[PDB]
Scaffold this active site. Structure first.
Site, PDB file in Angstrom:
ATOM      1  N   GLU A 174      26.335  17.758   3.455  1.00 38.34           N
ATOM      2  CA  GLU A 174      26.354  17.587   4.912  1.00 38.34           C
ATOM      3  C   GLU A 174      25.172  18.247   5.614  1.00 38.34           C
ATOM      4  O   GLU A 174      24.534  17.608   6.458  1.00 38.34           O
ATOM      5  CB  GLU A 174      27.679  18.076   5.507  1.00 38.34           C
ATOM      6  CG  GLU A 174      27.637  18.084   7.014  1.00 38.34           C
ATOM      7  CD  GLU A 174      28.978  18.115   7.700  1.00 38.34           C
ATOM      8  OE1 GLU A 174      29.637  19.175   7.652  1.00 38.34           O
ATOM      9  OE2 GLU A 174      29.277  17.153   8.443  1.00 38.34           O
ATOM     10  N   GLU A 175      24.878  19.519   5.265  1.00 36.32           N
ATOM     11  CA  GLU A 175      23.814  20.273   5.955  1.00 36.32           C
ATOM     12  C   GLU A 175      22.475  19.634   5.759  1.00 36.32           C
ATOM     13  O   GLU A 175      21.692  19.544   6.710  1.00 36.32           O
ATOM     14  CB  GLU A 175      23.793  21.743   5.567  1.00 36.32           C
ATOM     15  CG  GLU A 175      25.050  22.481   6.015  1.00 36.32           C
ATOM     16  CD  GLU A 175      26.235  22.488   5.069  1.00 36.32           C
ATOM     17  OE1 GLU A 175      26.258  21.702   4.089  1.00 36.32           O
ATOM     18  OE2 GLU A 175      27.176  23.264   5.349  1.00 36.32           O
ATOM     19  N   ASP A 196      29.409  11.051   4.965  1.00 32.76           N
ATOM     20  CA  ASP A 196      28.964  12.423   5.134  1.00 32.76           C
ATOM     21  C   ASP A 196      30.186  13.288   4.681  1.00 32.76           C
ATOM     22  O   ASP A 196      31.252  13.249   5.314  1.00 32.76           O
ATOM     23  CB  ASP A 196      28.562  12.682   6.598  1.00 32.76           C
ATOM     24  CG  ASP A 196      28.501  14.162   6.971  1.00 32.76           C
ATOM     25  OD1 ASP A 196      27.928  14.939   6.193  1.00 32.76           O
ATOM     26  OD2 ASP A 196      29.129  14.545   7.965  1.00 32.76           O
TER      27      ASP A 196
END
Ligand code: 7JB
Length: 507
Positions: free
Chosen positions: A299-300, A281
């Site tokens: 990541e989001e 990540d």
């Protein structure tokens, strides 16, 4: 033009097949287990441990919304009683949800914008979809949020800076806590000038409701797909959150370990094509980045499709240079299209991952935050290069576990974007950290065919020459000395990979 290069993907290692039979799950000084291990059974909802709610309102634990110490000056009144009164109301219009949330967040009634919540409900959803949200989804979310004292009975310790600690909780417990985060019930987590939680990410979802970004409805659809799923049918598995820090880092220049294997490809994704592998990540130091605010990159998107990752924000302190967060057992609830400004929620995803001996989905994700570079040449500074190597190394190393029980690392262009990372330098840094951590690398270039060949050709050149981690690190130091240290121009005269090829071939 081959879609992949190097070691075939079948020759790589995957989980739980490379998984050394888990020890008996048990709480200890370094492991918080919030369920009854003795009663843990496949397909059964875990039973919380302890039976009845125990509260800890201190500097070392999550401050629960249901705590009798969650009080507001009115004379001290109960903030939890207030949340119950505010939320147990029929919602028929977006304004009703905004008014309810703000009843226990008075100080933020002029600071929290709800435009995106109002626009999603009224201007995006069709009548029947809006009807299903307020008649079914939202009341079911309220009931699971309000069930918090019966579900999350054990105090949750904060995974604070320098702690080497794990938390194993149920997906049901995570759903109750994420329902609370949606309704912004977490106390002490809102102030701009807050001290106690200034080093912690945002947890409450108020920023998901602000502004007119066209990506807000995609985030909300992704999130409501999850909430609909988990309120309709209680999930049965567990999830582990481990904060890891390493005391002793390698003396890179001295590392005699050889390079490991590489599979590099311009097609595929970490989540689909990296099954059973250690999934990277590309994290923000405050884990989750802008998940419940504006951000919508690597990541989001992972935190939106696997919402159980978001709860790490409740207890994970901002990562220091020698730390990582390892999350095992998160489930994928959504499928998506695009990335960033093109990201769209597609449909619900039925996660087919097998579960391990602890009822955790066999999905291991590691959050490692790359550095942000003000200027391009900053990343070649030896201190900056050592930092990146030590970050990825801590993320890949599994202390005590042997080489043959370690899956390949599923990664890509870590810290390359708004952070200013050089893709070719970062690929070599991850290749070296994986080598020191005795793991192979599965590298996804996401449509960048030239980068796939560049990484492949460089990996094969160093491998064929038997160049160790030390030999490769010493070449990085020479690149800085010759091309970066005394360079006043924004970019160097010669690039990193042509310097390495020349330096080796002329030696
Ligand atoms: C996002 C996640 C964690 C759910 N999966 S993933 O495998 O990491 C990944 C899939 C697709 C892409 C990227 C990463 C990516 O970084 C990217 C960058 C620039 C343009 C397009 C993309 C893109 O489509």
């Amino acid at each position: 033009d081959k879609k992949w290069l190097g070691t075939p993907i079948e020759e790589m290692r995957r989980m739980p097949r490379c998984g050394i039979r888990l020890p008996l799950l048990r709480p200890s000084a370094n492991h918080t287990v919030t369920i009854r291990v003795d009663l843990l059974r496949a397909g059964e909802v875990p039973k919380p441990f302890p039976t009845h709610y125990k509260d800890l309102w201190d500097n070392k634990h999550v401050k629960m919304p249901c705590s009798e110490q969650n009080l507001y000056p009115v004379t001290a009144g109960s903030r939890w009683e207030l949340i119950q009164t505010a939320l147990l109301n029929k919602f028929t219009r977006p304004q009703n949800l905004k008014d309810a949330i703000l009843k226990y967040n008075v100080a933020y009634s002029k600071k929290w914008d709800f435009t995106a919540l109002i626009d999603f409900w009224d201007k995006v959803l069709e009548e029947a979809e809006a009807q299903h949200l307020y008649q079914s989804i939202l009341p079911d979310m309220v009931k699971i949020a309000l069930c918090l004292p019966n579900i999350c009975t054990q105090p949750i310790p904060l995974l604070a800076a320098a702690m080497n600690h794990s938390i194993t909780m149920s997906q049901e417990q995570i759903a109750s806590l994420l329902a609370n985060a949606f309704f912004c019930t977490f106390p002490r987590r809102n102030a701009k000038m807050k001290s106690e939680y200034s080093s912690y990410p945002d947890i409450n979802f108020n920023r998901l409701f602000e502004g007119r970004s066209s990506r807000k409805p995609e985030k909300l659809k992704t999130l409501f797909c999850y909430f609909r799923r988990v309120t309709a049918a209680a999930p049965t598995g567990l999830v582990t959150f481990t904060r890891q820090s390493l005391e002793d880092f390698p003396e890179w220049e001295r590392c005699e370990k050889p390079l490991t294997r590489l599979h590099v490809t311009y097609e595929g994704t970490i989540e689909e094509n990296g099954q059973g592998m250690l999934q990277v990540d590309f994290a923000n130091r405050f884990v989750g980045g802008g998940v419940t605010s504006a951000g919508l990159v690597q990541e989001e998107i992972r935190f939106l499709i696997n919402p159980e990752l978001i709860i790490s924000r409740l207890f994970t302190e901002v990562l220091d240079h020698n730390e990582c967060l390892i999350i095992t057992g998160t489930e994928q609830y959504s499928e998506y299209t695009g990335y960033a400004e093109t990201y769209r929620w597609s449909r619900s995803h039925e996660d087919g991952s097998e579960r391990d001996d602890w009822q955790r989905r066999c999905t291991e994700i590691v959050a490692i935050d790359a550095l942000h570079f003000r200027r391009y040449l900053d990343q070649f500074v030896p201190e900056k290069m050592r930092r990146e190597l030590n970050k990825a190394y801590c993320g890949f190393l599994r202390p005590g576990v042997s080489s043959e029980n370690l899956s390949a690392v599923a990664t890509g262009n870590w810290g390359c974007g708004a952070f200013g990372g050089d893709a070719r330098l970062k690929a070599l840094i991850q290749i070296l950290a994986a080598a020191a951590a005795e793991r192979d690398v599965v590298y996804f270039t996401f449509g960048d065919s030239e980068l796939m060949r560049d990484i492949y050709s460089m990996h094969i050149f160093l491998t064929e020459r038997k160049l160790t981690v030390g030999d490769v690190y010493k070449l990085l130091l020479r690149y800085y000395n010759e091309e970066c240290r005394n360079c006043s121009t924004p970019g160097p005269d010669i690039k990193l990979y042509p310097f390495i090829y020349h330096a080796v071939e002329s030696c």
